[PDB]
Design a protein. Structure first.
Ligand SMILES: [Zn+2]
Lengths: 309, 75
């Protein structure tokens, strides 16, 4: 029979497979839209379908690198294994954003996706561009499976939003992003630091962007207490993170935020978005309020250019 | 050289390190002194996350510097 093999679902390679032998005997590990077909023999119904295989020659290796920007040998098996589950999730539109109904501990992925849909970000790998476009259109199975694969997280595993965003930012073009900080010690003087890319958009220790602009107290190695403050920011967003703590979200002062209810061992994420009012998205669920107080872990802010006075 | 690590509970730990030590070895020493597994540890310096492959010298960590130890979330 005639079948097609692929690594990118764009460039197809015609193969003739013997229906008396398994796919595994002919191609190595083989997937049909996420389903493991290694141990299955070709069915009549398979004729003309596209199958994913592993990158087992130089041509496929090049195609895979150009599409995914990874050479992890296990990346495609992990992607397919994720997709086999994520294709069965539901992706309702909630307040105009693609969310994910609860399944398989996917609250962190739902929050990540909701956040991504509210900040200006361009992916570098074609795979992420394409899947994100479809996910925004409401078909997010491929996007979520790619997120899982890139982050080396299996379906069902407890996830952290901050870590996931860090990983995703690694695969985004944020190089132009720049952050200049100053640390002032009354004994030692002033020290500027410049950060580029991911380190320019992420901070762990306070949720408040305003406080970071005004100054946070940190130890100096001389033993005094120095003040660290933000001198300059060039980025389309910033992410301020801290261990989950009760925090009031005020309409109009932030883009979106993550809420974590639970503990270090066990917990749940919700998403808060600042629109005409504050909306709390919990998978398929949506509520609204004029104010917000809860255990916030991550806050996202709009940015373009900031220079300290 | 010595460094300090401030925990979520506010406890300050003292570690004997070298600038050539990787972050993985720092997490190993933290596990030796506290039991917190290296998989759960996330080390922060002046608000930036430190990655396991790089060394203390790569992040410009001098003597008596203070890191913060936070934990990964399980959402
Ligand atoms: Zn000083």
């Amino acid at each position: 029979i005639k079948v097609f093999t692929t690594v990118d679902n764009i460039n197809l390679h015609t193969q003739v497979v013997d229906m008396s032998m398994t796919y595994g005997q002919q191609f190595g590990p083989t997937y049909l839209d996420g389903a493991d077909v290694t141990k299955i023999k070709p069915h009549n119904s398979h004729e003309g379908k596209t199958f994913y295989v592993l990158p087992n020659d130089d041509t496929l290796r090049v195609e895979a690198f150009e599409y995914y920007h990874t050479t992890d040998p296990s990346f495609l098996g992990r992607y397919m294994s994720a997709l086999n589950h994520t294709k069965k999730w539901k992706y309702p539109q909630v307040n105009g954003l693609t969310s994910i109904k609860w399944a398989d501990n996917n609250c962190y992925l739902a929050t990540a996706l909701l956040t991504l849909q509210q900040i200006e970000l361009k992916f570098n790998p074609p795979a992420l561009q394409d899947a994100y476009y479809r996910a925004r259109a409401g078909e997010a199975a491929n996007f979520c499976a790619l997120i899982l694969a890139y982050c080396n997280k299996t379906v069902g595993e407890l996830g952290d939003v901050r870590e996931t965003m860090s990983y995703l930012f690694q695969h985004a073009n944020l190089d132009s992003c720049k952050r200049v900080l100053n640390v002032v010690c009354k004994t030692c003087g002033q020290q500027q630091t410049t950060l580029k890319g991911v380190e320019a958009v992420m901070y762990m220790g306070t949720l408040s962007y305003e406080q970071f602009k005004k100054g946070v107290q940190i130890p100096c190695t001389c033993g005094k207490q120095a003040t660290k403050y933000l001198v300059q920011q060039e980025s389309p967003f910033v992410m301020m993170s801290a261990p989950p703590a009760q925090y009031e979200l005020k309409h109009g002062t932030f883009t979106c935020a993550s809420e974590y209810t639970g503990n270090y061992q066990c917990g749940h994420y919700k998403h808060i978005t600042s629109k005409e009012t504050l909306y709390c998205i919990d998978g398929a669920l949506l509520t609204k309020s004029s104010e917000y107080k809860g255990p916030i872990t991550d806050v996202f802010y709009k940015e373009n250019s900031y220079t300290t006075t | 050289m010595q460094i300090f690590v401030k925990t979520l509970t506010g406890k300050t730990i003292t570690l004997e390190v070298e600038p050539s030590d990787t972050i993985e070895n720092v997490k190993a020493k933290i596990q030796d002194k506290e039991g917190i597994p290296p998989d759960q540890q996330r080390l922060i310096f002046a608000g930036k996350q430190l990655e396991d492959g790089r060394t203390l010298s790569d992040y410009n960590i001098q003597k008596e510097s203070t890191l913060h130890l936070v934990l990964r979330l399980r959402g």
